[PDB]
Design a protein around this motif. Structure first.
Motif, PDB file in Angstrom:
ATOM      1  N   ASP A 172       0.825  -1.209   0.000  1.00 27.48           N
ATOM      2  CA  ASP A 172       0.000   0.000   0.000  1.00 27.48           C
ATOM      3  C   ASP A 172       0.859   1.259   0.000  1.00 27.48           C
ATOM      4  N   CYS A 173       1.838   1.312   0.902  1.00 27.89           N
ATOM      5  CA  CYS A 173       2.767   2.430   0.911  1.00 27.89           C
ATOM      6  C   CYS A 173       3.535   2.510  -0.397  1.00 27.89           C
ATOM      7  N   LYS A 174       3.878   1.356  -0.979  1.00 30.37           N
ATOM      8  CA  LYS A 174       4.591   1.346  -2.252  1.00 30.37           C
ATOM      9  C   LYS A 174       3.745   1.947  -3.368  1.00 30.37           C
ATOM     10  N   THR A 175       2.460   1.593  -3.425  1.00 28.56           N
ATOM     11  CA  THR A 175       1.556   2.195  -4.402  1.00 28.56           C
ATOM     12  C   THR A 175       1.517   3.710  -4.251  1.00 28.56           C
ATOM     13  N   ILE A 176       1.353   4.187  -3.014  1.00 32.51           N
ATOM     14  CA  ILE A 176       1.280   5.630  -2.802  1.00 32.51           C
ATOM     15  C   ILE A 176       2.591   6.308  -3.192  1.00 32.51           C
ATOM     16  N   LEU A 177       3.727   5.719  -2.812  1.00 31.54           N
ATOM     17  CA  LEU A 177       5.022   6.332  -3.100  1.00 31.54           C
ATOM     18  C   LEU A 177       5.321   6.348  -4.596  1.00 31.54           C
ATOM     19  N   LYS A 178       4.954   5.284  -5.311  1.00 32.29           N
ATOM     20  CA  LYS A 178       5.090   5.286  -6.764  1.00 32.29           C
ATOM     21  C   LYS A 178       4.224   6.366  -7.396  1.00 32.29           C
ATOM     22  N   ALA A 179       2.990   6.527  -6.912  1.00 33.23           N
ATOM     23  CA  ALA A 179       2.155   7.616  -7.409  1.00 33.23           C
ATOM     24  C   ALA A 179       2.741   8.984  -7.076  1.00 33.23           C
ATOM     25  N   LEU A 180       3.484   9.089  -5.974  1.00 32.16           N
ATOM     26  CA  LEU A 180       4.072  10.358  -5.563  1.00 32.16           C
ATOM     27  C   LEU A 180       5.141  10.850  -6.527  1.00 32.16           C
ATOM     28  N   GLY A 181       5.773   9.952  -7.277  1.00 33.43           N
ATOM     29  CA  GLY A 181       6.729  10.334  -8.285  1.00 33.43           C
ATOM     30  C   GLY A 181       8.153  10.375  -7.777  1.00 33.43           C
ATOM     31  N   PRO A 182       9.110  10.412  -8.696  1.00 33.18           N
ATOM     32  CA  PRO A 182      10.516  10.508  -8.303  1.00 33.18           C
ATOM     33  C   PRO A 182      10.846  11.873  -7.719  1.00 33.18           C
ATOM     34  N   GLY A 183      11.881  11.886  -6.889  1.00 33.32           N
ATOM     35  CA  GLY A 183      12.340  13.133  -6.315  1.00 33.32           C
ATOM     36  C   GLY A 183      11.449  13.714  -5.245  1.00 33.32           C
ATOM     37  N   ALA A 184      10.567  12.913  -4.658  1.00 30.07           N
ATOM     38  CA  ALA A 184       9.790  13.369  -3.517  1.00 30.07           C
ATOM     39  C   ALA A 184      10.679  13.402  -2.282  1.00 30.07           C
ATOM     40  N   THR A 185      10.496  14.428  -1.457  1.00 29.89           N
ATOM     41  CA  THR A 185      11.249  14.510  -0.219  1.00 29.89           C
ATOM     42  C   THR A 185      10.713  13.502   0.793  1.00 29.89           C
ATOM     43  N   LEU A 186      11.557  13.166   1.769  1.00 29.99           N
ATOM     44  CA  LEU A 186      11.157  12.202   2.786  1.00 29.99           C
ATOM     45  C   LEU A 186       9.976  12.710   3.605  1.00 29.99           C
ATOM     46  N   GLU A 187       9.886  14.026   3.812  1.00 32.01           N
ATOM     47  CA  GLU A 187       8.759  14.598   4.542  1.00 32.01           C
ATOM     48  C   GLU A 187       7.439  14.352   3.817  1.00 32.01           C
ATOM     49  N   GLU A 188       7.422  14.527   2.494  1.00 34.94           N
ATOM     50  CA  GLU A 188       6.207  14.277   1.725  1.00 34.94           C
ATOM     51  C   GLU A 188       5.819  12.805   1.760  1.00 34.94           C
ATOM     52  N   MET A 189       6.809  11.916   1.699  1.00 34.96           N
ATOM     53  CA  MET A 189       6.541  10.486   1.815  1.00 34.96           C
ATOM     54  C   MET A 189       5.967  10.134   3.183  1.00 34.96           C
ATOM     55  N   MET A 190       6.495  10.740   4.249  1.00 37.61           N
ATOM     56  CA  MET A 190       5.947  10.508   5.581  1.00 37.61           C
ATOM     57  C   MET A 190       4.528  11.049   5.695  1.00 37.61           C
ATOM     58  N   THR A 191       4.260  12.199   5.071  1.00 34.80           N
ATOM     59  CA  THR A 191       2.919  12.771   5.101  1.00 34.80           C
ATOM     60  C   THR A 191       1.914  11.858   4.414  1.00 34.80           C
ATOM     61  N   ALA A 192       2.252  11.374   3.220  1.00 36.11           N
ATOM     62  CA  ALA A 192       1.306  10.599   2.426  1.00 36.11           C
ATOM     63  C   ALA A 192       1.100   9.177   2.932  1.00 36.11           C
ATOM     64  N   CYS A 193       1.893   8.709   3.896  1.00 37.89           N
ATOM     65  CA  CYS A 193       1.804   7.331   4.370  1.00 37.89           C
ATOM     66  C   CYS A 193       1.458   7.236   5.853  1.00 37.89           C
ATOM     67  N   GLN A 194       0.920   8.303   6.452  1.00 36.72           N
ATOM     68  CA  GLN A 194       0.878   8.400   7.912  1.00 36.72           C
ATOM     69  C   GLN A 194       0.060   7.274   8.539  1.00 36.72           C
ATOM     70  N   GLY A 195      -1.172   7.088   8.086  1.00 33.65           N
ATOM     71  CA  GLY A 195      -2.026   6.059   8.637  1.00 33.65           C
ATOM     72  C   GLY A 195      -2.171   4.818   7.791  1.00 33.65           C
ATOM     73  N   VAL A 196      -1.416   4.700   6.705  1.00 37.57           N
ATOM     74  CA  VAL A 196      -1.562   3.604   5.763  1.00 37.57           C
ATOM     75  C   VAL A 196      -1.015   2.309   6.340  1.00 37.57           C
TER      76      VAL A 196
END
Lengths: 221, 221, 221, 221
Positions: free
Chosen positions: B197-221
């Motif tokens: 699930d986190c992998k799906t979201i992170l792939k949708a987030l695109g390359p070059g996303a900061t770690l903060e954005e990745m933490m934001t988009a995966c908080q309750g996943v």
């Protein structure tokens, strides 16, 4: 310990209560595991023989350990007296007398005697020698309380290799075998008692492999 | 460390017993995890080379780690001697001699020599350089004792993303790869080893996303 | 060997064919077990270096053992040459020359040279020294062919204690560890690897029990 | 042994290699069973003390047996010295000196001394006495290695009576009890430990039956 006053003279300072309480926690909570010795050595850093007896009171409720310490200390005091025969003759007024075995252990001496003996150029360190006697006694106590033989330390089927190595070397520290026997143990018994997959890899690694190479080749196995 | 007496002169003060006991607890209880290095750096703050050898005695019962430290220190001392050739010639009376590799490590020097070398304007910090050599040795030890590869750090099906990130970056700190390899690891392997699930979201987030954005988009996943 | 003729002069007598056949049976039938060494020592009793090479031909079809023997013999010959440097100078007519390493092994010497060297008052025994070199080689061969570690010799649930003791000491003879390590083995590992009932009795018997007392207390167990 | 040369003079002849190899086979293959003693007595027939020490080297790899033999031999040598006090005084030129305990065992003597001592009219047999000491030591060794008590030798339900008798008397030979105890054993324990049918017949046969009559009455039972 020994501190300098405002006039530049050496003065004995007692061990602070929280240092003594740290030592009490070590004695009463750790079941005389091998780490009691580094902790004791750190906590008695720069101590006088009178301070060492304050730390030895904490061991007295443990009768077997206290008796083993007393036997070791009596043996060391007798050996010290034998190797340092009491010379009968005049002594220089600027030179102090020679402490006996009952004096280095602080049974019959006084605080100023120990301060003067330790504070000298060149020094005759009475704290360090009494400390080494205490450490010999504590090594014997750690040997007595050791729960497992080195022959019984065997890697679990899923245990990581580094954890098995740490248990093995901690027991080896507790057991205090002869140096040649210890070398045989680390070279042969460690490989012999590993689990099948790590054992296969270590046998393929060959004799005389360093411990670092063994840790490298078994990291995720 | 170095303290000023009542007359304004620099005096060496030994490490207090509870500081040494804190270091002993770190050595004997933490299995050379990566946090041993920040703790050692904090506990040896402003130390002399003679103090550093007192802290190195705690490592001696750990033979593999102690040998790795000794090899690193010998290598650094030899390199220091090579890069600082012993000049043969007269020296100013107001200038002190140049310590050798065996002197910065405190094997042949004395306390006053180290105090004088460190207490100078401008200073030549012998404690900091010996400390950096010790830290290189400790980094090697932390690498040797690391239980897992970075390739084996994988998010659990129900593991929160922040916990997986913390494990990943702690192992990365332990492994100490090259800087370019580390950048590749944090950019690619972290996303590759996440759970579906986190992998799906992170792939949708695109390359070059900061770690903060990745933490934001995966908080309750 | 060496025999006296009817005129009282020392004469070399070859090894009899059934003695050589006994040695051939030992080599070809016993798989280099530890008893090959007492048997070889008995069968080469009072032999010349030329006889010893006849007995060494039997080992040649076993290439690994033969090569190990050749390496040991070459090492011993080189060491003998080093410790016995060839003196350059005149020699008494009534005194014979000094054999070299290739001469004590009989590679370049002749029969009369060896007879004269051995038959002298006082004697310089060339057969005994070459024999000791052969025995060192054979000890290495017995170590190489040993099927089990001493760590793997364990008493069976119904095995009599004397049989386990015999297996243990035979393997110990094969392994040829250091003397201190061997003492540790016989004192500790023998008790550690016994079966539960004998182990209970031996633990109750206490440390420092002689092997005879252990055999007495475990006879029918 | 001792042989006569062509001039009629007694000369020592070494033990032949196949005799020594026979003794080696006895030592290394028979586990110190009771028949080791008749075989040793046959194989050392007419030997000198120097020959007996050659045969004793074969036992040295068996440390417990070798130590028991050494203790027995030292005890016998001390007893011999006590019962043969060294007379201080002149001795006839045609009479030889008196060997000591360390001389009959060949530790300090030489070959010609032993030949002269044994070859005399009347003889003082040094080989026979040392041999009897060796045999006492070997009897102790056979007792130590005995696997079963005489109390545990019991006839099997289908075992022929002659085989049970042979096992019983062989164990009795190994155990070497007192003469009265041995008589009680052969009279009572043999009948007590027989199987039911043979026991019925032997009880009907009455007390004081000879072993031949017991063998006759139990032949096919």
């Amino acid at each position: 310990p020994i501190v300098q006053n405002l006039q530049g003279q050496m003065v004995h300072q007692a061990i602070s209560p929280r240092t003594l309480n740290a030592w009490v926690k070590v004695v009463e909570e750790k079941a005389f595991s091998p780490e009691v010795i580094p902790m004791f050595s750190a906590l008695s850093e720069g101590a006088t023989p009178q301070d060492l007896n304050t730390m030895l009171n904490t061991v007295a409720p443990h009768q077997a350990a206290a008796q083993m310490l007393k036997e070791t200390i009596n043996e060391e005091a007798a050996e010290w007296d034998r190797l340092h025969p009491v010379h009968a003759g005049p002594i220089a007024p600027g030179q102090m007398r020679e402490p006996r075995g009952s004096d280095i252990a602080g049974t019959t001496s006084t605080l100023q005697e120990q301060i003067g003996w330790m504070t000298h150029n060149p020094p005759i360190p009475v704290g360090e020698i009494y400390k080494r006697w205490i450490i010999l006694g504590l090594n014997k106590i750690v040997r007595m309380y050791s729960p497992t033989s080195i022959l019984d330390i065997r890697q679990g089927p899923k245990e990581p290799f580094r954890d098995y190595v740490d248990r093995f070397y901690k027991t080896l520290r507790a057991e205090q075998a002869s140096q040649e026997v210890k070398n045989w143990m680390t070279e042969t018994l460690l490989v012999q008692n590993a689990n099948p997959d790590c054992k296969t890899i270590l046998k393929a690694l060959g004799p005389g492999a360093t411990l670092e190479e063994m840790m490298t080749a078994c990291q995720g196995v």
